[PDB]
């Protein structure tokens, strides 16, 4: 059960990371932070649940995938706003390690791990975006 | 022969891909069998050079999951527990499909014996999730309705 | 992976079922192949669930016994040694039978690890036995003569 | 269980050359396929007596040897790396190749549990061998261009 | 070995306790009790042989199946002639399991299972068919 | 599973072999073998139930301490009435220590043990009593 | 200990079923099934000693040999008296295998074994007798 | 020795986040955040100590439950000062459980592990009450 | 060697036998000793051969008795703790008896490491008995009384 | 069976004391086989009793004992290595002498897996030791040279 | 006791052989019978010693040779399976035999557990096998036929 | 890597043996022998390498067919010449199980053992064939 | 059944390299290697037999005795041919402890053991025979 | 003792077959060969003895060096006489890795081995110099 734990509870600490930084950005990628804090529930609902549970859709990466394509067009901390998506990034990193260690031991969250990576990708773009929306000013 | 049994799915499943697809009637089925035949091959390499190679990638995975929501969206709700069958398109895709899942199977049993890329496992599940989607599609533009058990 | 092996032999076996049906020309074979590709999800859960779901029962195997011997009747004497072939109905169908017969050898090994009804063994066996007498019947009705070996 | 796998993909095998062969179109196809067919039956002997009966012979090895030059010749040179497919004709056999060097697996495993005559593997590996030079041919005759990796 | 002697040996003590029984019983009723101590034979030369010989068929098992059929439309021993076929219902379903016991451990005797299997739930029905006939009169 | 197996089967038996043995006795001693019929039932429910199902009662086995006294007051088989009961006792025997075999595996089924092994004794003493009163005339 | 218990259990049950077979047969078939009665009484007796007591003798043997040379000279249960010794035989069979398992694992009871089994080959032919007795009418 | 350094670590990491997350509420918060630095202080020198160091008092977790009882009558990070003390019941969570793996490894630290988990579920209360009183405005 | 050991005193009790033959002067005896080193030979192929060839039977291990039977009635009331000994004749039996209990012991040990038949151990330890017969009378039919212990 | 091989060594060489005691032709010599055929149902006893039953004494061994000495007297040097022979006489007691050095390994492997009196073995030794004075007295009285190796 | 049981077995064979000597008529046999008597010390000394000492030559297991093809030229045809007897001088040799054939099995033991010379058991085999021969003759210069099984 | 040193020095044994035995032989024979050590070498090149390096052909073993074929229409060492031949008759035996010994334990030198086997039974009938050759002479 | 194997092919090496050996030769030596290249049959066909086969006589081993005390009264390779035999004798000592190791093994192969052993160096002999012929010259 | 045994056997095969070899070179080669057969005796002396006897001297294999490096400046068998030399290497390379596998076996036979390796080096340079010499005719 010590995999789910870490899993879960290492999600928990990455929402509240979001949570936090949701504050120094601009609507529109607060709302798209928000937006993750949904899926990441929906990935902490079926982890806990061990499968039972429904995760996150197909559909929800396809969105993430849409959404690196559309920022890769245009030291971590710039700025503090940078250092709190980078934050976030490594964090990210970490609970998509210990999502593949449950995965690996069961062989459940599949998409998650998935969508965590690209996740992490993301979270690397929005900080280095404004870094340059900042920079450009 | 720990990864060997692995690659004689590779081989076994590759061939069945390319049964199913000489029997499709659809280009876009025909062109997605094609491009995993090739992606097979590369997994294939990925596992008998424990990485040292070529290695399967993440647009390679993020291709397969463009394609099953797009297919997603033209079938719309899929009840569970399909019987199998319905047209030679769509029965020869779930022997495929079978094969595919018989696949990850081998590919679990590798990973705890020697080291595997996830990639490897992560493709190896979205094909038999969108080999699935084929098979529906198959008997939709047939106008062929599935049985629910 | 105990069982797990053991459903991934029925989805693979079930998918074949519905190709030799797609393919058969008969109806009382595809109903058959119908029933059990239904009887196939049962015995899937069966073993999933250590027999606390849905359960093989003896008419479901009194059933396959029903049809065998329905069968043996019109075909006559078996000799022994067939070589599996003929046309591609038949031949379709001694590729399920053997499916059907390593499905068996995956039932036995699960057993000497997990509990396992023996109604799912017993199923297991008259379904591979039963697949034999349909390829031979296609054979029959299609006038085309088996090859001993 | 030890040659009891064993039998069970020769018995696998065995229906898949037969469905392969009712769908060829050339009658040195089909006449190999048909030698095979038996010499599979005595393969399986070999095996299940511990070679106390009929035995794999060279002749046996010898004739498909001599049958995979003939053909390595109407082909010229083989690039690696063949995307199994082409036709249904070169699809079905690189179905039962695949089963081939599936069953070549199966006999690696029971030699080193139980005794096995050599010349079992070596006909193993030489069928694998040819069933490729079949799907290729397949293709040739019908002008078919093989897909290379 | 074992689990081979202890099934045929078991199998020869249910064959005799209908021998006993077949004397109880109308003619209808012995011609059949008749049927199965040689189809038993047949299934104890199976076993005996370790499979070389050939067992029982399945026309054996679909003429069962026609009897339970046959006699499903109309505390053990109502009568004595009752309790005779009920005590042979209880040796039935022992040889059943001790036959069960030869399969999962060598993979011999399918249709001998199901043949004692169906068997024993006719035994049940032939020992209530007299309590009925007894009782209607 | 198989002592639980072994337990009821042989229990089977037993009630069977009574039920047969019940026709040769006056109503009175028919009444009890009847009686105990109902009691081993309530054992193969406790058992085959690994002790869900409530067994019999400690009223159940001071009835037949009853019946030890009241009869102990007053070669198997003087007669073939005698040889049934005696027969039965043989069984009784058996599935005491079937029984036996259940508990020290589990810890199930106390004063089933308990009212089997008064039961053997009381078989025997009825055998021993048709024996004295058929003597007696 | 447990060969030793299945041995004599399974003894006491064998003496019962003569004890209800002799009650049809001649005078003289019965003299002959009491006195086995006995035999298979000083069986037990050296069984349950573990062979501090003396069991059957040579002579006992000898005797059963006698008798099988005597009768030779003239599907189980021909008659319900035919079918009671052929059940007799089944059962000293096991007996016979029950008491050979104890034999192998301490080195006591050959002459029991012998015994046990020249009986149970007795057991066959006085079946057939009565049949041949009955049929010869 | 790792579950204590984990323990102890993992609890440097926990009164570091308040430390900076008190900088963020109003006095009464703060004074209440500050008197928490202490008992984990008291805590951490229990557990670093192994046992020896006296821990906590019970009148120290009555406290706490004062407070949960005070709060509770009126997605993390409603604002960024909810998203501080949400961060730091995450933290609480995980702190409690590497001590709870103190606790059945050794069996020390058994107030610890209730008064981190009467904390966490304060946490969410503080972080929940901001969220009400700027939305209440 | 596991029968091994068996065997070679199956060859030393029989060349022990055919010396206390040589000695007996009572031809009811000398007869026995014979059909006994027979009998051996008889035993040695059951063993040696698993059962397959000639076996013992049950009237071979009859005849041992009804002898035995038939001598315990000329000598009478058998006290126990015999010295051995008392002419030559009884000596040279006492030996041949040793050797016979050495030669249960023997088979005891086998049977416990290969399968032997019941018959064999049977058959051996009723000759032991009968060994000490023939020491007793041929002291009765020389008036030698025994020492007890 | 522990002690059972020491017991039936015990009865082996027992016999064969009584059968060099019927050959020789002098009186402290048959007395002296004699004690011991005795002596060997008490040592008998002790080892299958544990010791709880009679047990071998001092004396049983000091009378050994005081006989070898007596007869070491008669013979004078004992030069080493005689090969065992000379006369009937003679060579019967060589024949027991070995068997009871074999007694002797037979309580030595016995002590090592369940207990044994020291006395046993004490005895067990004296008495191979006295056996050799015997075969040598006897070629004495006789007047036969031993030879030496 | 590794090799504490072989020489105990050489010392037990070989007072076997001095009985049988004193029992012979014949100078020839008698003679071989010392020499073996002899070559049983050095046997002994070779085992004992590790063969540090005094060795088992080839001459020595020569000589023997040399002697049973001189004999079987005498008997002629050996029919198989020879029950042992025939006379007290042929008797005496086939226990002497027998002794030898159980040493041959202790060395055998022994070999497996410690270090021996080759020649120790090929002499030991061939002293078996001559002393067979001896007993043969014995009963031909008696005019005594051997009885075959 | 022992079974390959093995399988290849012993294979250099059989080449320099063949070199030796091609100076006895017409220019035929010689020409044939001279095209084997060509293959043997081959042979041991797909050994050393492990498979990497590609051994021996098809059409290779086709040849020897064709050889053998041509041959078989027309105590060791008749001639010298022929005791040569049977020489290395002897040792193509040797490698032909040294290299089996190869693939049982890796895979590898399929063809390889197959050419070899052939060619045993070549130099068996070219032994003979001068043995012929001389003596029709 | 690798010692066999080795013992065998071994034996083919020895009687191959006599077969070249006995062109060297006079009449006389060549019809003794021609009679050992007999006796080497029934050895290897004693040996590949695993002992149902008979092999050599003890006639054979005197034969050779006989031979060894003829020769013995009258650096390899003095001469060519002294050399063959000489090479001979090496084979003969290896194929001597390749046979050697199959008795250990079985307990198969005793003659032959001895007859080998006698064999080399009676090779031996020989070889110093033509040695001392040339050199008397 | 095993890797002795064959060491030293392999070694008497070598030494065995450059006595026949010796017999078609110069006077001049012919001395050299008689002189390694000599050093090998002395090899196979301190291997028999197992280090107790001295071996070859140092001398020994700076005088191989000097050859090689005299010869080196001038298929296996382009004649007999080549071929036989060529068989020799071969015999070298096996005698030098079954002494090498007596070294890493006990730690004896250091030089021996250098000696063997040099030894096939030169075997070869003598075969191909004949090759020239008589290709330069």
């Known amino acids: 059960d010590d995999p789910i734990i870490e899993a879960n509870g290492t999600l928990d600490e990455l929402t509240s990371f979001i949570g936090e930084a949701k504050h120094y950005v601009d609507e529109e990628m607060k709302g798209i932070l928000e937006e993750i804090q949904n899926d990441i529930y929906k990935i902490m609902g079926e982890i806990g649940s061990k499968g039972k549970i429904e995760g996150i859709s197909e559909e929800r990466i396809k969105w993430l995938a849409g959404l690196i394509e559309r920022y890769s067009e245009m030291l971590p901390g710039g700025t503090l706003e940078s250092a709190k998506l980078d934050v976030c990034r490594t964090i990210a990193r970490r609970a998509e390690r210990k999502v593949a260690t449950v995965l690996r031991e069961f062989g459940i969250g599949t998409l998650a791990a998935i969508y965590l990576a690209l996740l992490s990708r993301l979270l690397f773009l929005l900080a280095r975006v404004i870094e340059i929306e900042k920079n450009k000013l | ?99 595919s ?18 990639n490897v496992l992560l493709y190896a599940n979205m094909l038999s999730n969108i080999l699935f989607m084929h098979a529906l599609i198959s008997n939709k533009r047939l106008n062929i309705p599935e049985k629910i058990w």
């Open chain 2, 1 to 99: 022969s720990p990864v060997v049994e692995v690659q004689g799915t590779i081989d076994e499943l590759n061939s069945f891909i390319g049964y199913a697809l000489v029997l499709s009637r659809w280009d876009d089925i025909r062109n997605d069998l094609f491009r995993i035949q090739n992606d097979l091959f590369v997994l294939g390499e990925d596992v008998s050079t424990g990485g040292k190679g070529r290695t399967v990638t993440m647009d390679m995975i993020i291709y397969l999951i463009k394609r099953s929501v797009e297919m997603k969206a033209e079938i719309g709700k899929i009840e569970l527990f399909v019987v199998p069958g319905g047209s030679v398109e769509s029965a020869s895709l779930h022997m495929a499909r079978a094969v």
């Open chain 2, 101 to 118: 899942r018989r696949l990850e199977r081998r590919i679990k049993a590798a990973s705890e014996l020697t080291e595997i890329n996830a």
